[PDB]
Amino acid sequence: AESHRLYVKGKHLSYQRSKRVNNPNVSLIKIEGVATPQDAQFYLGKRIAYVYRASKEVRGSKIRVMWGKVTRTHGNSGVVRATFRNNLPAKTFGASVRIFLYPSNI
Amino acid sequence: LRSLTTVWAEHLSDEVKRRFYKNWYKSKKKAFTKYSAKYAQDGAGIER
């Protein structure tokens, strides 16, 4: 078909932070279509991939992936907390992530 | 205000086109030579 997407679009908002200090080990992700903590309960435990591109091909691809998962909700407007194997570079604030539908409880 | 079109005359005198040169003496003088080729036609590019 015209579309082949099997993930949910998301945006990397920022790290977990107070007013003056931030915590790079935990990031905030905005999932499209979610606007309340009840909706984000479905997405807890799902895997998040950040798919960026480099110029050096490493093992047969110029595309590199950063993996993570959704841990808990955040606030009142459907923002979630995520942790990755390696933290996102903070240059990707406002970049798109990929929230997958696995593992599935359906 | 922003100019959108400039149209020039068929023949430009040898003293007005010295305004467009810094070293006039060493040149082929190469000024409006192709623009004068826009003329010699009835309406090709002048009143368009």
Binding site: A1, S3, H4, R5, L6, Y7, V8, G33, V34, D39, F42, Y43, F100, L101, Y102, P103, S104, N105, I106 | -
Partner: protein, 167 residues
């Protein structure tokens, strides 16, 4: 001597581990996974394909077939957490399935010496494919538009919210 000596060398013999108390109980699958249910594959070659769940194997995997004649998915096993169980239920009563087990899908691990420089199918695997399909294909035709539904591929369009959709 550059280094004099350590007075007491640690004993180099390994010690036994304690008696672990972790028994293994059979996995309890979620109620949405019933044999004959149509599933959606979320990962693999056939991600986005709709496929028919036949049997639950010993190693927690789900036996599944396309059928092959409909969408090309052969007899495989998949992980229960990597699929979505749809509500479209179809009967598999009368399908010979007990033959397939954990040892049926043997990879026959290759040696490291056989390095792939630049670049086949078992005869018994295709024959078991048509036997399973024949008992299934003639039964898919009963409900209209199921074959066109199975042959098609699933994907997410603009505006679908998986937390509100009913799969």
């Amino acid at each position: 001597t550059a280094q004099q000596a350590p007075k007491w060398y640690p004993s180099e013999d390994v010690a036994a581990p304690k008696k672990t108390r972790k028994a293994v109980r059979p996995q309890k699958l979620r109620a949405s996974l019933v044999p004959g249910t149509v599933l959606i594959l979320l990962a693999g070659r056939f991600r986005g394909k709709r496929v028919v769940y036949l049997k639950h194997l010993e190693d927690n995997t789900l036996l599944v077939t396309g059928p092959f004649k409909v969408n090309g998915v052969p007899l495989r096993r998949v992980n229960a957490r990597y699929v979505i169980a749809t509500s479209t239920k179809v009967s598999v009563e009368g399908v010979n399935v007990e033959k397939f087990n954990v040892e049926y899908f043997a990879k026959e691990k290759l040696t490291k010496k056989e390095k792939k420089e630049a670049n086949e199918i078992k005869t018994e695997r295709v024959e078991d494919q048509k036997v399973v399909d024949k008992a299934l294909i003639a039964e898919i035709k009963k409900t209209p538009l199921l074959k066109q539904y199975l042959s098609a591929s699933f994907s997410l369009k603009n505006g679908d919210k998986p937390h509100m959709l009913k799969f």
